[PDB]
Each structure stands twice: as C-alpha cells, then as structure tokens.
Scaffold this motif. Sequence first.
Motif, PDB file in Angstrom:
ATOM      1  N   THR A  69      55.112  22.999  57.012  1.00  0.00           N
ATOM      2  CA  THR A  69      54.847  23.965  58.065  1.00  0.00           C
ATOM      3  C   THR A  69      55.246  25.366  57.603  1.00  0.00           C
ATOM      4  N   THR A  70      56.476  25.489  57.124  1.00  0.00           N
ATOM      5  CA  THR A  70      56.993  26.749  56.608  1.00  0.00           C
ATOM      6  C   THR A  70      58.125  26.458  55.632  1.00  0.00           C
ATOM      7  N   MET A  71      58.194  27.194  54.534  1.00  0.00           N
ATOM      8  CA  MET A  71      59.253  26.985  53.555  1.00  0.00           C
ATOM      9  C   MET A  71      60.285  28.098  53.634  1.00  0.00           C
ATOM     10  N   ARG A  72      61.374  27.829  54.348  1.00  0.00           N
ATOM     11  CA  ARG A  72      62.459  28.791  54.502  1.00  0.00           C
ATOM     12  C   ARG A  72      63.096  29.101  53.153  1.00  0.00           C
ATOM     13  N   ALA A  73      63.574  28.068  52.475  1.00  0.00           N
ATOM     14  CA  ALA A  73      64.187  28.237  51.164  1.00  0.00           C
ATOM     15  C   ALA A  73      63.453  27.414  50.113  1.00  0.00           C
ATOM     16  N   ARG A  74      62.261  26.928  50.486  1.00  0.00           N
ATOM     17  CA  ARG A  74      61.416  26.098  49.616  1.00  0.00           C
ATOM     18  C   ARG A  74      62.017  24.707  49.400  1.00  0.00           C
ATOM     19  N   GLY A  75      63.249  24.663  48.912  1.00  0.00           N
ATOM     20  CA  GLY A  75      63.877  23.407  48.555  1.00  0.00           C
ATOM     21  C   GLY A  75      64.415  22.637  49.744  1.00  0.00           C
ATOM     22  N   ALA A  76      63.554  22.369  50.714  1.00  0.00           N
ATOM     23  CA  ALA A  76      63.909  21.531  51.855  1.00  0.00           C
ATOM     24  C   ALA A  76      63.413  20.111  51.614  1.00  0.00           C
ATOM     25  N   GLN A  77      62.759  19.942  50.473  1.00  0.00           N
ATOM     26  CA  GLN A  77      62.181  18.671  50.076  1.00  0.00           C
ATOM     27  C   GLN A  77      63.206  17.819  49.338  1.00  0.00           C
ATOM     28  N   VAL A  78      63.367  16.584  49.779  1.00  0.00           N
ATOM     29  CA  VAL A  78      64.224  15.633  49.084  1.00  0.00           C
ATOM     30  C   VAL A  78      63.383  14.487  48.516  1.00  0.00           C
ATOM     31  N   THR A  79      62.529  13.929  49.366  1.00  0.00           N
ATOM     32  CA  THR A  79      61.573  12.895  48.982  1.00  0.00           C
ATOM     33  C   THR A  79      60.534  12.765  50.085  1.00  0.00           C
ATOM     34  N   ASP A  80      60.154  13.911  50.623  1.00  0.00           N
ATOM     35  CA  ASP A  80      59.304  13.976  51.796  1.00  0.00           C
ATOM     36  C   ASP A  80      57.840  13.795  51.422  1.00  0.00           C
ATOM     37  N   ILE A  81      57.014  13.551  52.429  1.00  0.00           N
ATOM     38  CA  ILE A  81      55.613  13.221  52.222  1.00  0.00           C
ATOM     39  C   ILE A  81      54.743  14.107  53.106  1.00  0.00           C
ATOM     40  N   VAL A  82      53.532  14.423  52.663  1.00  0.00           N
ATOM     41  CA  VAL A  82      52.621  15.173  53.514  1.00  0.00           C
ATOM     42  C   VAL A  82      51.388  14.350  53.832  1.00  0.00           C
ATOM     43  N   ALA A  99      46.002  23.507  53.382  1.00  0.00           N
ATOM     44  CA  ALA A  99      46.979  22.441  53.530  1.00  0.00           C
ATOM     45  C   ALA A  99      47.233  21.756  52.187  1.00  0.00           C
ATOM     46  N   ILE A 100      46.204  21.703  51.345  1.00  0.00           N
ATOM     47  CA  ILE A 100      46.317  21.103  50.032  1.00  0.00           C
ATOM     48  C   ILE A 100      47.072  22.045  49.119  1.00  0.00           C
ATOM     49  N   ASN A 101      46.685  23.298  49.204  1.00  0.00           N
ATOM     50  CA  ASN A 101      47.280  24.370  48.440  1.00  0.00           C
ATOM     51  C   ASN A 101      48.779  24.455  48.697  1.00  0.00           C
ATOM     52  N   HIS A 102      49.185  24.215  49.934  1.00  0.00           N
ATOM     53  CA  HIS A 102      50.595  24.192  50.283  1.00  0.00           C
ATOM     54  C   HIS A 102      51.254  22.937  49.699  1.00  0.00           C
ATOM     55  N   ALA A 103      50.518  21.836  49.724  1.00  0.00           N
ATOM     56  CA  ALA A 103      51.026  20.556  49.250  1.00  0.00           C
ATOM     57  C   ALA A 103      51.187  20.536  47.731  1.00  0.00           C
ATOM     58  N   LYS A 104      50.192  21.047  47.010  1.00  0.00           N
ATOM     59  CA  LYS A 104      50.228  21.056  45.548  1.00  0.00           C
ATOM     60  C   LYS A 104      51.151  22.137  45.050  1.00  0.00           C
TER      61      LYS A 104
END
Length: 178
Positions: A69-82, A99-104
């Motif tokens: 949705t939005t990347m505050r500090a980008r590294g909010a990902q641990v092992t998340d899925i879209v 949505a793909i562009n954000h995902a890739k």
Amino acid sequence: GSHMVERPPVVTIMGHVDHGKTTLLDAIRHSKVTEQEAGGITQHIGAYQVTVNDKKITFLDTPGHEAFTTMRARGAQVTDIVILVVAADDGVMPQTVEAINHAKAANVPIIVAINKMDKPEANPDRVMQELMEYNLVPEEWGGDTIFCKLSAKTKEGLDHLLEMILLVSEMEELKANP
Ligand SMILES: Nc1nc2c(ncn2[C@@H]2O[C@H](COP(=O)(O)OP(=O)(O)O)[C@@H](O)[C@H]2O)c(=O)[nH]1
C-alpha cells in the motif's frame, strides 16, 4: 527491537480495478470467516485477518506495517506476500501494472488470482501470461508466483485461494524446494 512476537503477514491485495479491488474484500467475507464481524468491509479500518488457519493473513495492510500500500521505510517486509488480482476477462491493465511495478520493486513473491472465471469469457492462462510478461512466473511454470484461477463471483476460487495461502503459510519457514 524485541517488542514484537506476533507476526501477521500483510498480504496486500492489489491488481486492477473492476477485477475486484474492494469487492474481493467483501467476497472474501461472504465466503466464510466473517459475517457480522466489523472488519474488512465497513468504514472504520480496512481489510482484516482471515481465518484460514487462525487469522494469520492480514489482507491489504495494517496501520504500522504497510508493504504494498505504502512503503514508510521500505523494509517492512519480513516474508510477506502480495496478491495480484487480474480478471481473466480483462487481464493486465494500467493500475494492474503499477501493482506489479510496486511488487517487483521489492521483488516479492506473488499470489496472483485470475477472477471472473465465473465468466465463460474467462481467459485465465491468457491474462496469467501477461503477468509473466512483467516477469511474474507462476510456480506451475517455475518462476516465483502462486497463481489462482478463481471466480470471486461464483465463490469458487476464493476458497481455493486461501488453500494456496495456507500451503504457503505452512511452508513459510524453509519449505520451497523440500
Ligand atoms: N465477473 C466478476 N466480476 C467481479 C469479480 N470480482 C469483482 N467483480 C466486479 O468488480 C466490480 C467492481 O468492484 P468494486 O469493489 O465496486 O470496485 P473496485 O474495488 O474499485 O475494483 C463489481 O461491480 C463486480 O461486478 C469476480 O470474481 N467476477
């Protein structure tokens, strides 16, 4: 820091509009889990934790851990899925790509869902291929994405979707090759 122990993966749902941006968050409730529960589709807060296992899947995002949705500090990902929703009748469209562009951009493994398979005009593997054109290759093909050919209208693949999700939820630790 060690001020967190419960990790609900923020499986952000994305894709094109009319393919069921918000309608799937309704469709998902009117499939099971929540009926009278004030979550997912109301107004106060958006989305919710679906009970496929034990509510371990917070679709879209949760205030404080926004991934796609939005990347505050980008590294909010641990092992998340879209989840990338593409209508089999419509396929990849403008905001679908974004949505793909954000995902890739993060390069996260995807959970595509080809909806409108209720439509006889459903062209799943067609629109599915458009994903691999943005280099989103299903694991049926050996890329890095779990696709689902579902119909959130006939309420068929929504059930099959959470199944693929729990499969991933179970293998979450190390399983991918083994
Ligand atoms: N055929 C079909 N239509 C769907 C499906 N999911 C959503 N829709 C349609 O998507 C339209 C847009 O949904 P809405 O939530 O209002 O819009 P959005 O959230 O901006 O995509 C609805 O009018 C539904 O008819 C699906 O699985 N199959």
